[PDB]
């Protein structure tokens, strides 16, 4: 970066970034910590069913609570992009990681 190492980008609850996310030998996310999952859950809850963004390694995931009516503590994971090159190149791991994140959020 063209800025001092004593300065970092200001964060937002709209965009959560998890730096040291463990990777599995099959090129997938491992189990996130309980504190990480609770932070994602609480942030999605505070946004009342509207999507928040979650950065795991170098990919972006969209997460919302209110996945189903009746239970607000149900979480949905999706992803979206415009650049065809990144989708063409990463869609398989992106989808698999999205499944895993959803599974961890609801277990």
The number of beta carbons lying within 10 Å of the beta carbon of residue 31 is 14
Instruction: Specify the experimental method.
Output: X-ray
Given in angstroms, what resolution was this structure solved at?
Answer: 2.5
Residues ≥6 apart with Cβ < 8 Å to 86: none
For 12-95, strand residue ranges (E) read 15-18, 52-56, 59-64, 76-78
Q: Rounded to whole angstroms, what are the CA distances from 1 to 7, 8, 16, 98? A: 10, 10, 20, 29
Residues ≥6 apart with Cβ < 8 Å to 15: 52, 53, 54, 55
Residue 56, token pair as written in the block:
């795991």
The number of beta carbons lying within 10 Å of the beta carbon of residue 66 is 18
Q: Rounded to whole angstroms, what are the CA distances from 61 to 2, 4, 6, 26? A: 27, 29, 28, 19
Length of the chain: 107
């Amino acid at each position: 970066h063209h800025h001092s190492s004593g300065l970092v980008p200001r964060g937002s609850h709209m965009f959560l970034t998890f730096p040291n996310v463990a990777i599995t030998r099959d090129n997938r996310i491992d189990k996130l910590s309980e504190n990480d999952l609770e932070l994602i859950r609480d942030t999605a809850i505070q946004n009342g069913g509207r999507k928040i963004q979650v950065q795991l390694r170098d990919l972006l995931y969209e997460v919302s609570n209110r996945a189903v009516e009746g239970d607000n503590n149900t979480f949905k994971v999706s992803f979206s992009t415009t650049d065809r090159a990144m989708f063409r190149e990463r869609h398989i791991e992106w989808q698999g990681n999205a499944i895993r994140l959803e599974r961890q959020l609801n277990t």
